[PDB]
Every structure is written in structure tokens, then in C-alpha cells.
Design a protein around this ligand. Sequence first.
Ligand code: PC1
Ligand code: 3PE
Ligand code: LMT
Ligand code: LMT
Ligand code: SF4
Ligand code: SF4
Ligand code: SF4
Lengths: 112, 155, 176, 207, 94, 114, 76, 115
Amino acid sequence: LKKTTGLVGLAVCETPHERLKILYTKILDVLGHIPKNAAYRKYTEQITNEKLSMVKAEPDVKKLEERLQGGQIEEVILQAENELSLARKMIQWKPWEPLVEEPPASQWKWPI
Amino acid sequence: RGEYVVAKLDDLINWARRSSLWPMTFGLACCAVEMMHMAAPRYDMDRFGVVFRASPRQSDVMIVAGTLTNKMAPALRKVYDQMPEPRYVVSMGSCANGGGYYHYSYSVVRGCDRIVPVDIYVPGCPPTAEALLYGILQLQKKIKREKRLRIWYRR
Amino acid sequence: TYKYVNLREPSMDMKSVTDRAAQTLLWTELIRGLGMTLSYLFREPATINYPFEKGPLSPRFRGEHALRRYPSGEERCIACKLCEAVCPAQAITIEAEPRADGSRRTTRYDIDMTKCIYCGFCQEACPVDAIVEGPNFEFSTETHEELLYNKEKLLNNGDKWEAEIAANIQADYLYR
Amino acid sequence: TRPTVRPRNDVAHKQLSAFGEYVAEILPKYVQQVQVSCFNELEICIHPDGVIPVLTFLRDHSNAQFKSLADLTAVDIPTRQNRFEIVYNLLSLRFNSRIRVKTYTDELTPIESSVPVYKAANWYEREIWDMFGVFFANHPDLRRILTDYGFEGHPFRKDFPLSGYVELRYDDEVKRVVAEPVELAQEFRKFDLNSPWEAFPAYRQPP
Amino acid sequence: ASATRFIQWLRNWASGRDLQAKLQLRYQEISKRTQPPPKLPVGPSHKLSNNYYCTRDGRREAMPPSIVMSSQKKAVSPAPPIKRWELSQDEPYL
Amino acid sequence: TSVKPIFSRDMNEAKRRVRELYRAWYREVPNTVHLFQLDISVKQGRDKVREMFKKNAHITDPRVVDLLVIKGKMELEETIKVWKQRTHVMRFFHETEAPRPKDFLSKFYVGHDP
Amino acid sequence: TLEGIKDRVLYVLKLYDKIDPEKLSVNSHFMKDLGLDSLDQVEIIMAMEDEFGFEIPDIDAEKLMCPQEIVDYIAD
Amino acid sequence: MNLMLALLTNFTLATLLVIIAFWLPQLNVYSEKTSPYECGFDPMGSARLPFSMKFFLVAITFLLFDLEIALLLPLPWASQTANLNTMLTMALFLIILLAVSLAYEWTQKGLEWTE
Ligand SMILES: CCCCCCCCCCCCCCCCCC(=O)OC[C@H](COP(=O)([O-])OCC[N+](C)(C)C)OC(=O)CCCCCCCCCCCCCCCCC
Ligand SMILES: CCCCCCCCCCCCCCCCCC(=O)OC[C@H](COP(=O)(O)OCCN)OC(=O)CCCCCCCCCCCCCCCCC
Ligand SMILES: CCCCCCCCCCCCO[C@@H]1O[C@H](CO)[C@@H](O[C@H]2O[C@H](CO)[C@@H](O)[C@H](O)[C@H]2O)[C@H](O)[C@H]1O
Ligand SMILES: CCCCCCCCCCCCO[C@@H]1O[C@H](CO)[C@@H](O[C@H]2O[C@H](CO)[C@@H](O)[C@H](O)[C@H]2O)[C@H](O)[C@H]1O
Ligand code: SF4
Ligand code: SF4
Ligand code: SF4
């Protein structure tokens, strides 16, 4: 087991495989309440399932870290927690809805 | 003779004051880096009797080493007022001399001599450490010329 | 590649533990630091004896400004105002008119030395090597007004310093 | 490889374009324009209502991870009815990438404070308020940061004069530093530099 | 350089280093303050032919930004994930 | 004409914020004079506060009123915490500036400014 | 102590110099009769908070426009 | 006498130096010069406001420990006693109880400053 993650304040996780399975499964559950055709759901389910596949099929932490390309396994756990927090927030924002308002005529024209 | 005595007494106090100049630990911007290089071993301002002291109550000279902004102006005037007399101001660098590169800014004082009286103006941006040392030695020779007791005698 | 600056595990063999106990109780690493300052006490100091000795400089040094002449004595400046246009500080002020012999010459050429940032752009911009920054850095004054140079002051600087300025330009003009 | 010409990195341009429409697909409620410059910088132009949703998504989404707010600034363009353009420059360490998010506002319209997303944004928003007068809603502590105490105006606006309106000096009668209308011994000399000949045909605007 | 032998020994011992091999005061190993004149090279555009400016004009190749989307399939990231750094083989631990 | 509010939804709500700010300034003047050791009286300080509120009496835009109140609160905070110095407090009284008469003739004699 | 409040309140309105005591009555409206404006009224309300030593919210304060209506208010 | 003469001379010499220091130099007193110092800006609040003491418990312990040394300083004289068995036992006893009290205050976190 790792003695240290190397990043100050990031504690080493004793059970990273199970923790990742909990988090990705939670992320998928939250996406279920997002509309099917929302691009956030389709993309996040796709990339979330890839990580869940890699955790299930790879028992060694170091070999799993190489597959995930997310840094330390504790870094990957934190990213999963961040994605789960974003998915909940997305439900109230509903950014899949059409553009709230067009900008004025020359709002983005440069040079003036 | 009274004149001979006050002439010699002027030399003593003038010698003591210029031989023991303590600048206030006061720096503002880039010019303070060259001021740091005057204290550094190559020039060793300490060897002339020039020693930094933090407290204005224990300072004889204010070296305005850098830009004076409007927000800073009341503070600079405050610590100048809090220096016991006699006290001297050396203006270092274009910013302190007259605004320099920021002369036309809305936030800069166009010369520290709008705020305090200035004894010596050291030109440059920044003046070399040697140029500042030349300015300090110029201040010393100004103090050497003072005639306080001679003028008092003829009052 | 990276390296760790502080990720090492002290050994726990009795000799190493005692070595550290002696360090803690006998102040061995503090005594060691005293040795370093002692060695400096007996090193020759780096101080130079200003003003009898001077810090080294190079021909490119940017100091007090000066207006130069041709060997005949005619002014090099022909009032093109390139130095005035480039000056980052707007330190230069120029007026010009046809001279009594028709020459294109300045009637005003001021440098506010309290505005100037001693950047040397003016001498880069000058097409005739008229305005230069000379090697003088010992010209601090007792009044602000003494640092507002007009054309007479700048020409006097050129006449005062031309011997050094010409030699400094000779050493460096092939890098320009 | 012409020696004096900056080389083109086409791989980055393709990668940033792909991610550009990736963000537009996911946040259509807010994204108004996406562009990639010829030196491979991706800019996302959004409606101001989407400052928190867009920034939160870029920080938190697993395919973005823009964890660092490199810079937050404003630009004043007086000819626009929304004269202030607010610019977020973000950095992604995971993907070694940068992205710029831009929105807009006017003198009287507040922008949501993004401190809840990036704690770095605290002082950047104080600077924008100080120098441009843009108000940020729900800022924990919004006040001047750069200008003098009691300073009036927002200096970085294009119509604020370079030398301001007041200057300082010490007045012996009142024994304090005073502020008075600005007079310059030498007025700043305005230079008209632009050549009357077009330089870059590629950027010509239609007549 | 002018220190006596005993003084050199004393300060060598005190510091634990041989201080005479790397003195911090400069003597004669520094360059002469007068040098021969240079003869600097020219650049790649110094030619008399095949040198039309329009073929070497970087500014006129700059283009307005490509509009990807305006308001007038696999997930992607801005770039591939960053490769993990390797430990130094010069000196991994300080 | 549909715009995002700052705080107040209408001038009636805005005027409430103004009154609360006026109370805060009115209460603070005695503290400012005492703490800063000013040589003006509390009446002068409160008259000046009234003068500053009066110059903006003609505003009818709730968003503009809200921004004036926000700045008023910031100015008050600078004073209460002695971030301002005596020079900053006294700048409201323009003590060192000579009167500029407003009659046509007086301007005519002195220069070209209208 | 209703009877005494009509004296306390009128005691304050007399100190506030802008008021003319001859023109002042327990029913004189601050705006129309006494020639005051919103900020003067606000200042009056602050003086009342001192004598009776309690806070009068703005929602409450704005309704008090005559010396009488304050007395009715203090009673509660 | 010698002692009182020596003390009087020292403190008179110091007093004369202060008298010269105040009456010899030229003075120029005004309000800003004599204002309290705080790095250029006016102080916020009186310097007489309470200043919390985070080592208050060590300070009280100092009183108790400072009296122990009054009990110990006679030890050089007590060592001249013929009854050295009792004296050595009571000397060691007193110092140990001082050490025990120190160890108690240490283990109970009395020597850590309040945060
Ligand atoms: C370890 C202790 C060290 C002690 C060191 C003692 C210092 C030894 C050197 C003494 C030099 C002589 C003193 C001159 C310095 C005076 C300060 C000064 O600059 O004033 C300028 C002033 C200048 O005054 P002024 O009239 O020209 O102008 C000032 C007024 N305005 C501001 C309007 C311009 O000189 C004097 O006023 C008088 C000078 C007299 C010099 C003779 C001094 C006599 C000493 C007796 C003083 C009476 C009090 C008794 C003190 C104890 C006596 C020893
Ligand atoms: C026959 C039986 C015999 C029985 C008796 C035997 C007794 C002898 C054996 C006992 C041990 C002997 C040494 C005791 C000396 C005191 C040691 C000591 O107190 O050092 C510890 C102290 C704390 O060090 P620290 O690492 O910070 O903390 C420890 C972990 N808590 O460390 C420090 O004090 C740091 C001090 C910092 C300030 C130092 C500044 C000066 C350093 C240079 C001084 C050189 C000494 C010169 C002395 C001159 C004497 C005239
Ligand atoms: C928290 C409570 C802690 C209490 C700790 C008490 C510790 C006391 C330890 C014993 C100290 C004295 O120890 C005792 O000293 C006496 C004399 O000094 C010694 O006595 C010895 O010297 C004396 C004379 O000097 C002779 O009379 C005697 O014949 C000889 O044996 C004892 O041999 C020794 O046992
Ligand atoms: C007869 C006199 C000589 C005998 C020594 C008498 C003094 C004894 C001192 C106390 C001894 C035991 O009491 C003390 O308890 C605390 C627990 O908080 C320990 O203290 C602990 O935290 C402090 C602060 O970080 C540090 O000292 C140390 O890192 C750690 O050990 C001490 O290591 C231990 O010494
Ligand atoms: S004068 Fe030049 S070096 Fe000195 S503070 Fe100003 S800009 Fe910096
Ligand atoms: S050195 Fe620079 S700032 Fe000074 S006059 Fe020349 S161009 Fe202007
Ligand atoms: S650039 Fe040279 S020639 Fe032209 S105005 Fe300046 S000094 Fe004169």
C-alpha cells in the first residue's frame, strides 16, 4: 500500500477499487434523471462507463493507475467525487435547454 | 573670539551629523533594489557610517527609493514628520524625482518634492548603486557646509 | 524529470540514533554554522574604496545624455524628432526651424531627466548619432530644476564628454 | 519552415476545435460563440447568465478539469451597448490545456461572482470592480483594491482620462496632504500614429 | 589571493571546503576589458534573389479566428492526458 | 426595458436602502470626528453628509440608486475601520481650494472657461 | 405613561432647530406644515429612538409623519 | 556608605545625560511629529486596549517555580551541616517535587500556549 500520495492533504485510500465502483455507480444513477438526449448525459455516461470497465477488469492499483491516466488513484477518486457533484448541479441548471438569449448585433465583433 | 569658537563648534556638530547618517528602512519600488546593493559588500555603505534603522524616531535621512503613489503619499509624509530633526530627504530615481515613467498616471505623485522637502535628487531609472552612493556623499558635503551656529551667533 | 527535495527516512540503527542525540545535545550542526562565518572573517572583503575606486562598466552603459557634433563642429541633430517620437516617457521636447543659413536645426531640445527612464531608445532611434547616453552617472543635484535639461546644457554635455563618448561609440558601433 | 515565420501547429487547432463544439453541445443554454485563433487558443463566448454553470462544468467535468483560474479581467469597448467584456482564462493541468471564457455586461448589470468556483476570483473581481465599475453579485467582500481611498471613478474605462481629475500635494496651512484639480506643467502630447493605409487585408471589414 | 598559508588553512578548515579553488573575488581569469571588433553574421533574408517579401511575411499569414460554432460520437478532451513525469536519474532524492 | 436588478426592484425599495444608509452615516459622524480628531463639529460633518445625499436627489433609476448606495456603504466601511486617514475624510470639505465665482462676469474676467 | 409622552416627543421636536415652535402642534405634518423633507423626518425618528431607547424600523418609521402618530407608536 | 555612594553616582550620571539630551538640542514640536508611530498610518484603537496573554498559565507557574529557588539557594550553606543524611534527603526531595510538578504541567499541556 502507498505510504503517501505525494500531494499535500490528499490522504491515501485503503480501498480504492471499491470506492471507485461506488462513485461511478452513483454517477450513473444521477445521470438517469437527466434527459436521455442531453449531451451531458450521453458523454458522461460514455466516459464514466469506460472508467468503471477499467476498474473492474484490473485488480492491481499501479496497473489500474496506468490505464486510467488520471494520476494517483486518489486523484481519480477525487475527480469522480467532483463529477458526481457536477452532475447533481447540472440537474438544476439544465444547460441542455436552448440558448437563453442571443447577444446584441455586434457583441463579439473584433476589431470594432 | 566668539566667531572662532562657534566656527569650530559648527565643524564638530556638522562632522558628527554627516559621519553618522542613519537612513530610515524605507523603500518603495525598483530603486530600493539598488539601495539594497549599496548596503551589499561591494559598496558597504556601513563603512561610511551609514546604517539603516527601521524606526523613524531613530532615522536621520529618508531615501525615497521608488514611485510615490497618491495612496502612499499620506504615509510617506507621516513617517517624515515623525523623524526628529535635523532630518534630510534624498530623492532617488526618476519616479521620486518627478514621476518618471508614470508621470502622467492618475495615481502617481509627480515628484516626492510635492510632499516633502528634498535635499538631494539622484537621477536614473534606477540610479546605479554607485550613483546613489555619490548622492549620499553629496548629502554629507551639504551637511558639512551648514552654518547653524555661525548664523545663530550673528542673530 | 523531477526530484524530491525532502523525502528521506532517517535510519534507526543505534549508531545513527546516538549520532543524532549528540547532534541534539552538543549542538554540532550549530557549531558547524559558526565555522562558515569564521571562514568569512578571514576572507578578504569584496568592498571597493569608492570614490577612489569605481565599479566596472562597459561601453554600452546608459548614463547622462549629451548632444554630439561632427568633426567640423556642426551639430549632428537635424531635428527629425525620431527620439521625441520613440521616448517611452515623453521626456523629450523639440522645436525646430530653418537656421539663418537654411539648415534644419532645433531651437528647442529639452530632456526632462526626472521623466526619463534612461532606456536608450532615443539613441537607437537617432539616425545621425546626435543624442547619446554618455558614461556619466555622477550628476545628482540639489534642486529639481537642475535636472530639466535644455539644448544649451545638452550641448555642453557633449562638448564636456565627447572624448569618452566617441571612444565608447567606437568600441560598440559594430554591435549596432 | 521559413525561418522568420511562426510555424503552424495543426494538431492543436483540430484538437481545440473538437473540444470547442464538445462544450457547445453540452451547454447550449449559454454558449453563444466558439472560436479558435490562428495561434491555437480556444475562446468560449457565453451569455452572462451561464457564468457559474459554464465555469463549474469546465472545472469539474472529467473531460475538462480546468482546475486553475489563471486570470480574470475585463475589457472596455465603448461602442458596444454592453461595453464591458469579462474574460476568464483557465488552465487544465490534467490535459495541459488552456481555455478562455468570455461574457459581457454594462454599467448597471451585475455579473455573478465566481468565487464559489475559483477562490482565486476573489481579488480579480475586486480589481474589475475597482478599475471598471462592474458589480459582482454575492461577492464575499467587494471593495476597491488598487485605487486610493475614496477615489472617484473607474480608471481603466476608455473615457476616464489618463491623468485623472485630481492630484495630491502637501499643504502647509492645513498640515496635511490635500487633493485638488489636476494641472500639468506639460500636457501629455497626443500622437496620431495610425497609417492611413490598410495593413492586413485578411481582417478587412465589409463596407 | 594574498592570504598567507596559515590563514588559508584556517578558513579552509573552518568552512570544510577548499576555498582557494573557487574564490568569489575575480582576478585575471576574467576577460580583457578591450576586445577585438566583432564581425556579426547576417540573417537568412540577406539575399539578392529568390527573396520576395511576400513569401516570408509572417504578419500577412495571420488569419481571423476560425468560428467553430455560432448562434447567428465520442467524448473529447482539450488534449490527450498529460504523461506522468519520471523520477530524475541524475539525483532522484535531495 | 426588462433588465436584471442589482438589489432594489423599484424606486420604492431603493429609497428604503437610501434611508438606512443615511442613518448609518448620521450615526457615524460623531465617531468620525472623535476618532480622526477632526476640528470640524458634528453639525458640519452631518451637514456635509446631507449635502452628498442631496446632490443625487434627482435619480429615478432604481439600478443607479442601488449603485450609489453600494458605494455609500463602501465609503462608510472605509471610514469606520480607519482605512481612510484624516486627509481622506477632509477631502469632502475642499479646504485648500479657492472659490470660483459662478457669475458670468467673474468667469469672463479670469479666462475663457465657460 | 401616555400623558408624559406628549411632553417627551414635543420636547424633542422643539430641540430640532429646523422646526418653528410657534408653527408646531401635536398634529403638525412634517412635510406640509413644518416644511421638512424625508431626511429631516429620518433625523427626527433617530432622535426619538434615543429618548425612548429603542429601534424603529424603516417600515415603521416612514408612517410617522406627525408628532401625534409617534405617540400612538410609542404606546405599543 | 560606599554602596549608597555608588548607586547615587550611577543614577545621577544617567540623569545628567537625560538632562543634556533634552536641553541641548534644538526642538521643533508639532502635532504630526509627536503622533503615535504605526508604519505611516494612524493607529486603529488605543494601545491601552487589552492584550491577550497566551502564556498565562506558564506565567502563574513561574511564580511557584520562582519561590522554589528561594528554598534552594540556601543549599550551599546547608551542605555544611553535620546532619548530612537528613539534609541530602530533603534537598533531593524538594527538587524531585519540583520536577514532578513540571512533569505534571508538561503532560497536562499546561506549557502549550492558548491558540
Ligand atoms: C555620552 C554623552 C555624549 C554627549 C555629547 C554632547 C555633545 C558635545 C558637542 C556639543 C556641541 C555644542 C552644542 C551645539 C548643538 C546645539 C544644537 C543645535 O544645533 O542648535 C542650533 C541652534 C540654532 O538656533 P537659531 O537661533 O540659529 O535658529 C533656530 C530658530 N529657528 C527655527 C527659528 C530658525 O543653536 C542655538 O540655538 C544655540 C547654539 C548654542 C551653542 C552652544 C550650546 C550651549 C550649551 C548650553 C545649552 C543650555 C542647556 C544646557 C545643556 C547642557 C550643557 C552641556
Ligand atoms: C559521571 C556522571 C556524569 C553525569 C552528568 C553528565 C552530564 C553531561 C551529559 C548531559 C548532556 C550534556 C549536554 C547538555 C547541554 C544542553 C543540551 C541542550 O539543552 O540542547 C538541547 C536544545 C534543544 O534542541 P532541539 O533540537 O531544538 O529540541 C530537542 C527536542 N525537543 O538545543 C539547544 O539548546 C539549541 C540552542 C540554540 C541557541 C544556540 C546559540 C549559540 C550556539 C553556539 C554556542 C556554542 C557553545 C559555547 C559554550 C560556551 C561556554 C562558555
Ligand atoms: C517524591 C518523593 C521523592 C523522595 C526522594 C528521596 C531520595 C533520597 C535518597 C537518599 C539521599 C541520602 O542518601 C543517604 O545519604 C547519607 C548521607 O548523605 C548516606 O550516609 C553516609 O554518609 C553519612 C555521612 O555523610 C554517614 O553518616 C553514613 O554512615 C553513610 O552511610 C547514606 O549512605 C545515603 O543512603
Ligand atoms: C529529576 C529532574 C530530571 C527529571 C526530568 C523531569 C522533567 C520531566 C519532563 C516531563 C516528562 C514526561 O512528560 C512529557 O509528556 C509530554 C506529552 O505531552 C511529552 O511531550 C510531547 O509533546 C511535546 C510537544 O510536542 C514534546 O515535548 C515532545 O514532542 C513530546 O514528547 C514529553 O516527551 C514528556 O517528557
Ligand atoms: S525610477 Fe525607475 S527603477 Fe526607480 S522605482 Fe521608478 S521605474 Fe523603478
Ligand atoms: S533614454 Fe529613454 S526615456 Fe530617456 S530620453 Fe531617451 S528615449 Fe526618452
Ligand atoms: S533623433 Fe537625433 S537627429 Fe532626430 S531630433 Fe532626435 S537628436 Fe535630433
